Design a protein around this ligand. Structure first.
Ligand SMILES: NC(=O)C1=CN([C@@H]2O[C@H](COP(=O)(O)OP(=O)(O)OC[C@H]3O[C@@H](n4cnc5c(N)ncnc54)[C@H](OP(=O)(O)O)[C@@H]3O)[C@@H](O)[C@H]2O)C=CC1
Ligand SMILES: NC(=O)C1=CN([C@@H]2O[C@H](COP(=O)(O)OP(=O)(O)OC[C@H]3O[C@@H](n4cnc5c(N)ncnc54)[C@H](OP(=O)(O)O)[C@@H]3O)[C@@H](O)[C@H]2O)C=CC1
Lengths: 473, 473
C-alpha cells in the first residue's frame, strides 16, 4: 500500500504512460525484466516524480494498494503469458492485470476466462497514439472482465486524451477480447487510410505532374475541409520535408511498406466471419505488393502500360475530384469497418456502443479526425443503424462525391495509376446499392457442376436442385 | 488378400469413384459407417461388378492385399480423425490411408507426421470434378508421405482424367499438406473465375441490354476463342435454360452465393504468408456481399447511382472489349494463384512442379481449360519462372488486351456496374508493372507517427529514423 498501479515494461511506450499517469497524480511503481532499466529510468526520466521502482516482482506486488492493479506493456505473445504465470501466485483474489500490448483478441479471451476462475480480474486494453499519445493522452480501449472497470476507470480516463467537450477517449469496450478486437480494427482502418492517401498522392504526382511542394499545399488545403485529420496533416509535412542536402526526402525512400501484423488480422477476421471489408484487404495486399520490389523492377522492364495520352483538363478541378474520391472511399472503408465490428459483436455476444468507439478514435489514436465526430453523432441519432451508408449525412456526402469519384477512377484507369482501394470502395458501393446482383449466376453454376441447390427469389427458404445436364436428351 | 483398395464413405462421390476404380479392373471393398448403405450399393449401383462389401471395419481390413490401401471419402474434420484412430490398431506398419475429403492442409500435415512414426504411410489427396468426374475421370492431387506413391500410382493415374496426349491429370504433388493445399488453391481460383464470368454477364446485361438468349450466344462464341473452358461452356447452357413455364430460369434465382469454405482459406493463406492474391480475395468478399440481400434491398431504396447516360457505341465492339477484359483478368488471378503456390512451396519446403499442377488442372477439375495448357508449357519452357506475367505468351496476351480492358472498366465505372475482380486485376497489373510505387509514403508515415524506421532507395539494408516532428523548432 502506497502505489496506485504498477506498469511492467520500460520501453518508450511504458515509460511515457507512467509519466502521464504520474502527472495526473497517481503514484506508479515501475518494474521491467531487465531490472537495471528501473534504475536508469528513476535517475533519468522519472527523477523528481512520485514513481517508485521495484527490483523484484514480489516487492512490486508489495507496493500496491488493494485491489492490486498492474499493467503489462510488454511484447505481445509468450512474454505476456510468462508474466501472468509469475503474477498469479502472488496476487489475491480480486486483483487486476491489464495487458496493454497489441495482443491477439483470442489470446485475450482465453486469458480473461482462465483468470476468472482463479478470481483474478483481467482486462485487455488497446492503447493507441504512439510515444506522444502515451505521454500526454493516449486513446485507450479496455475490455475483458467488467468487474475491473470501477477500479481502473479513474486512471484510464484520467490519462486518456480529451475531445473538445472534455470527454475522455476511453470507455469500457466489452467482454474478454473486445478492447483488443477494437484496437486491431482501428489498425485495419489505419492501413486503409494510408493507402487511400498514397493513391491520391500517386494521381497528383503522375497524372497532374505536381511537384512535392504543390502536393504538400494541396494536402494542407484538404486538411481544412472535411478531410481534417492527423494523417492528411502529417502527409503535408512529409511532402515538404527536405533533407540535409536541400532536396526532398520522400523521393529517396524505398517503397517496401512493412507491417507488424495487426492489419493482416482485421482482413483475416473479416474473411473468417464473412464481412466484405474489401478496402482494408486491398490495403494489406498493397503492402504485400510493394515488398516485391525487385520483382516490380524486373516487371517494369517488360510489362507495357497504356498509350501515353497527356492530361488535358483543369488541374484545379481534377485536384478537387481527387479530394472527393478520397473522401467517398474513406466513408466506404469506415462503413466496412463498423459492419465488421457489428458482426464480431454478434459472434461473441458483445454489446458494443459504436458511438462510444467513434469517440475513443476521435482523439489520441492515429486515425483521429473530425470525421469520427460525424460518425459518433450518426450512431447517437440512431444507435441501431445497420450501416453507416444509410445515415443521411454519409448518404449525402457520398452522393455528392460520386461524379468526381468516377471521374478520378476513369482517369487513373486510362493513365495506368494503380488504385486498389479507390476501385474496391467504388465496386463495393455499386455492389451494395444493387438490390439484384449476378450472384444468382454463381448459384446456377454451383448447382450445375456440384449439385449444391439454390433458392428462388420469391419463396426464399426452399432449396431446389435443377438437372441442367440434360433437359431433353 | 483379394481386394486391391478399400473406400470408406458411400455418398455419391465415394460411390462413383469405386465404380470408376472397378471399371479399370481394380477390386474394391466398400464400407461406410451406416453399414446398411453397403448393402444398398451392392444390390443396386454396384450389382454385377467386382466390388466387395464389408460390414465391419475389421473385415474390410481383412479383405485387403498388403500394403493395405484404404481411402477416406468422408466429411472433412472430426470424422476423418475418428476413422484414423480406429484404423491404426488394425493396420500393419507400411499400410496406406488416403484422405480424399476436402481437408485443411494443416490437418493433413499433422496427420501425415503423426502416422509416420507409427509406420503408417498417409496421403492426403485433393479430388475434383464432382460426381461426373468421380465416375469417369476425376482430377486427383495426392500429397503426404512419398513412400505411399508407388503403391497407389497405378490406381490413381488409372482412374484419373486423361488429357488429349493421354497423360493423367494426377501426379505426386509433394509432402504432407501439398495435395490438400493445391486442392484449395484450385477452389480459390475457381471462385475467381466464376466472379469474373458474373461481371462480364452484368455488363452485357445492364450496359448492353442484351437478353439471355443473345448473352448465351456471346458466351458460346467466346468458348471458341482462348476463353475455351468448362465454366464458359456451362454458363452458355445456364443462360439458355428455360423453366417449365417457358421463361428463363436464371432471372428467378436468388442472388446470395453460398460457400463451403475452401475459397475462404486460399485468401486467408495469402494474407498469412504475404502474397497479393487480390482477385480471389475480392471473389470471396463478393459472395459475402451477396449474402446481405435484405440489406442491399434496403440500400437500393436510398443510395443513388451515377447519372443515367445510355450506352452509345457498337455493341459488337464492346462485347469484344468485355471478352478481352475477362481474359486479361483471368490471366492476372492465375499469376496471383501460382505466386501463392510458389510462396507456400518456400514456406513448407515443397518442391512443386508448377507445369505438373497445370496438367492436373487441365482435365477432370472444374477450372479445366485450354488455358491451363498454355500455363503448362510456360513452366515447361522455364520451370523457374517467378511469375506467369513474365512469360512472353501472357505478357503478349495481356499487352494485346489492355486497351479493351481499360475501356471496359471505365464504362462499367461510369455506368455503375460493380466490378470487384475486373478492377483488382487491373490495379494489381498496374501495381506490379511499376518499379516505383507510393509505398515509400507509407514508410514515411510509419516512421513519423510510430518511429518504425525506413531504408533508402540506394543503400537498401540500413534502417534510418528521421525526426520529422520538428526540424528547426
Ligand atoms: N498501430 C497503432 O495504432 C499503435 C500501435 N502501438 C504499438 O504498441 C507497441 C508497444 O510495445 P513496445 O513498448 O514497443 O515494446 P517491445 O515490443 O519492443 O518489447 C520490449 C518491452 O517488452 C519487454 N519484453 C520483451 N520481451 C520480453 C520477454 N520475452 N519477457 C518479458 N518481457 C519482455 C521488454 O523488457 P526488457 O527491456 O527487459 O526486455 C520491454 O519492456 C509499440 O511498438 C507501439 O508502436 C502503439 C500506439 C499505436
Ligand atoms: N470445389 C471443387 O473443386 C470440388 C469439391 N468436391 C467436394 O468433395 C465433397 C466430398 O464429400 P461428400 O461425398 O459429399 O460427403 P459428405 O460431406 O456429405 O459426408 C457424408 C459422407 O461422409 C460420411 N460421414 C459423415 N459424417 C461422418 C462422421 N461423423 N463419421 C464418419 N463418417 C462420416 C457419411 O457416412 P454416413 O452416410 O454413414 O454418415 C457419408 O459417407 C463433395 O461435396 C464435393 O462437392 C468435389 C469435387 C470438386
Amino acid at each position: 500500500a502506497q502505489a496506485d498501479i504498477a506498469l511492467i515494461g520500460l520501453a518508450v511506450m511504458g515509460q511515457n504512460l507512467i509519466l502521464n499517469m504520474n502527472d495526473h497524480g497517481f503514484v506508479v511503481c515501475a518494474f521491467n525484466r531487465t531490472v537495471s532499466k528501473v534504475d536508469d529510468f528513476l535517475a533519468n526520466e522519472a527523477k523528481g516524480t512520485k514513481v517508485l521502482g521495484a527490483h523484484s516482482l514480489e516487492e512490486m506486488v508489495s507496493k500496491l494498494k488493494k485491489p492490486r492493479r498492474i499493467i503489462l506493456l510488454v511484447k505481445a505473445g509468450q512474454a505476456v503469458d510468462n508474466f501472468i504465470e509469475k503474477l498469479v501466485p502472488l496476487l489475491d483474489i480480486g486483483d487486476i492485470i491489464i495487458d496493454g500490448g497489441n495482443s491477439e483478441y483470442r489470446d485475450t479471451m482465453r486469458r480473461c476466462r482462465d483468470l476468472k476462475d482463479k478470481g483474478i480480474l483481467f482486462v485487455g486494453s488497446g492503447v493507441s497514439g504512439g510515444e506522444d499519445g502515451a505521454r500526454y493522452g493516449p486513446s485507450l480501449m479496455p475490455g475483458g472482465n467488467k468487474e475491473a472497470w470501477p477500479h481502473i476507470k479513474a486512471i484510464f480516463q484520467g490519462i486518456a486524451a480529451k475531445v473538445g467537450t472534455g470527454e475522455p477517449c476511453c470507455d469500457w469496450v466489452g467482454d474478454d477480447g473486445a478492447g483488443h478486437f477494437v484496437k486491431m480494427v482501428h489498425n485495419g482502418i489505419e492501413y486503409g487510410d494510408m493507402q487511400l492517401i498514397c493513391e491520391a498522392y500517386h494521381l497528383m504526382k503522375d497524372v497532374l505532374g505536381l511537384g512535392h511542394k504543390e502536393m504538400a499545399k494541396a494536402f494542407e488545403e484538404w486538411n481544412k475541409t472535411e478531410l481534417d485529420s492527423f494523417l492528411i496533416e502529417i502527409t503535408a509535412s512529409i511532402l515538404k520535408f527536405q533533407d540535409a542536402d536541400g532536396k526532398h526526402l520522400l523521393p529517396k525512400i524505398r517503397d517496401s511498406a512493412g507491417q507488424k501484423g495487426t492489419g493482416k488480422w482485421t482482413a483475416i477476421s473479416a474473411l473468417e466471419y464473412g464481412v466484405p471489408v474489401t478496402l482494408i484487404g486491398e490495403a494489406v495486399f498493397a503492402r504485400c505488393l510493394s515488398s516485391l520490389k525487385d520483382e516490380r523492377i524486373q516487371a517494369s522492364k517488360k510489362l507495357k502500360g497504356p498509350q501515353n495520352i497527356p492530361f488535358e483538363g483543369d488541374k484545379k478541378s481534377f485536384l478537387e475530384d481527387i479530394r472527393k474520391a478520397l473522401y467517398a472511399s474513406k466513408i466506404i472503408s469506415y462503413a466496412q469497418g463498423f459492419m465488421l465490428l457489428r458482426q464480431a459483436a454478434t459472434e461473441f455476444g458483445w454489446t458494443l456502443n459504436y458511438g462510444g468507439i467513434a469517440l475513443m478514435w476521435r482523439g489520441g489514436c492515429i486515425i483521429r479526425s473530425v470525421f469520427l465526430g460525424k460518425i459518433k453523432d450518426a450512431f447517437d441519432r440512431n444507435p441501431g443503424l445497420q450501416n453507416l451508408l444509410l445515415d443521411d449525412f454519409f448518404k449525402s456526402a457520398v452522393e455528392n462525391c460520386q461524379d468526381s469519384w468516377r471521374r478520378a477512377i476513369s482517369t487513373g484507369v486510362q493513365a495506368g495509376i494503380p488504385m486498389p482501394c479507390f476501385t474496391t470502395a467504388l465496386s463495393f458501393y455499386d455492389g451494395y446499392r444493387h438490390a439484384m446482383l449476378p450472384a444468382n449466376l454463381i448459384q446456377a453454376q454451383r448447382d450445375y457442376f456440384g449439385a449444391h441447390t439454390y433458392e428462388l427469389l420469391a419463396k426464399p427458404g426452399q432449396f431446389i436442385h435443377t438437372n441442367w445436364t440434360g433437359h431433353g436428351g
